[PDB]
Every structure is written in structure tokens, then in C-alpha cells.
Amino acid sequence: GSSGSSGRVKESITRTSRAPSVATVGSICDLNLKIPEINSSDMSAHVTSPSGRVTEAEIVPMGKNSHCVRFVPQEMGVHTVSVKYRGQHVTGSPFQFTVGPLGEGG
């Protein structure tokens, strides 16, 4: 029930859930992630489907502290990226984003 602001486990945390870019469907998408010196051989990128399927993603070599993931986020629902480093979810992980088809230009 309700608490008197004395200190109790959380129930529902309010957030934004907004992406810095738009994700498309059936097309290569470049995902930029601010990663430190950490390398890829140590990291692991895998996209999870709302059906229970797990895929693999490639981390193209950008720079010393830069990395890019190119993959085709195509599912029947919501897409969720699982980026863990040595068995630990990084900041903003897993990453959830909604996909949509490309209609007109503008």
C-alpha cells in the first residue's frame, strides 16, 4: 500500500523512454553507443525478439573509444537490444525502441 515517505521498495519508476533517433524495419540500422576503451571481443551485442528469439549483432571498429552496431531490427513487436560487458548491463540497457515502416519523405 501507500507509504509515509519513510523508505520502502519502489513500485513504479517514471521515465522517458525516448530514442535519440528513429529505427526502421527491414533495413540496416547504425546504432551509436558511447563506449569507453572497452573493446568488442569483451562486449556482446544481441537483439532480443518479442517472440523469444535471440539474434547477433556486429560491432564495426570505429575508434579507440567508439563503436557502431549495424543490424536489421525486424520483429513482430518491440525490439530490445541486450548489450552486456563481461556479464553486466551497461547504462541504458537493455535498449528498447519501436520500429516503423518508411512512408513518405516530407
Curated annotation (Swiss-Prot):
Written domain comment of the UniProt record: Comprised of a NH2-terminal actin-binding domain, 24 internally homologous repeats and two hinge regions. Repeat 24 and the second hinge domain are important for dimer formation. The first hinge region prevents binding to ITGA and ITGB subunits.
Protein name: Filamin-B
Annotated disorder: Interaction with FLNA may compensate for dysfunctional FLNA homodimer in the periventricular nodular heterotopia (PVNH) disorder. Atelosteogenesis 1: A lethal chondrodysplasia characterized by distal hypoplasia of the humeri and femurs, hypoplasia of the mid-thoracic spine, occasionally complete lack of ossification of single hand bones, and the finding in cartilage of multiple degenerated chondrocytes which are encapsulated in fibrous tissue.
Post-translational modification remark: ISGylation prevents ability to interact with the upstream activators of the JNK cascade and inhibits IFNA-induced JNK signaling.
Protein family (similarity comment): Belongs to the filamin family.
Recorded name of the encoding gene: FLNB
Subunit structure: Homodimer. Interacts with MICALL2. Interacts with RFLNA and RFLNB. Isoform 1 interacts with FBLP1, FLNA, FLNC, GP1BA, INPPL1, ITGB1A, PSEN1 and PSEN2. Isoform 3 interacts with ITGB1A, ITGB1D, ITGB3 and ITGB6. Interacts with MYOT and MYOZ1. Interacts with HBV capsid protein. Interacts with ASB2 isoform 1; the interaction targets FLNB for proteasomal degradation.
Function: Connects cell membrane constituents to the actin cytoskeleton. May promote orthogonal branching of actin filaments and links actin filaments to membrane glycoproteins. Anchors various transmembrane proteins to the actin cytoskeleton. Interaction with FLNA may allow neuroblast migration from the ventricular zone into the cortical plate. Various interactions and localizations of isoforms affect myotube morphology and myogenesis. Isoform 6 accelerates muscle differentiation in vitro.
Shown segment, full-protein numbering: 2094 to 2192 of 2602
Tissue specificity of this protein: Ubiquitous. Isoform 1 and isoform 2 are expressed in placenta, bone marrow, brain, umbilical vein endothelial cells (HUVEC), retina and skeletal muscle. Isoform 1 is predominantly expressed in prostate, uterus, liver, thyroid, stomach, lymph node, small intestine, spleen, skeletal muscle, kidney, placenta, pancreas, heart, lung, platelets, endothelial cells, megakaryocytic and erythroleukemic cell lines. Isoform 2 is predominantly expressed in spinal cord, platelet and Daudi cells.
Modified residues annotated as Phosphoserine in this record: S21, S27
Filamin repeat placement: 8-99
Source superkingdom: Eukaryota
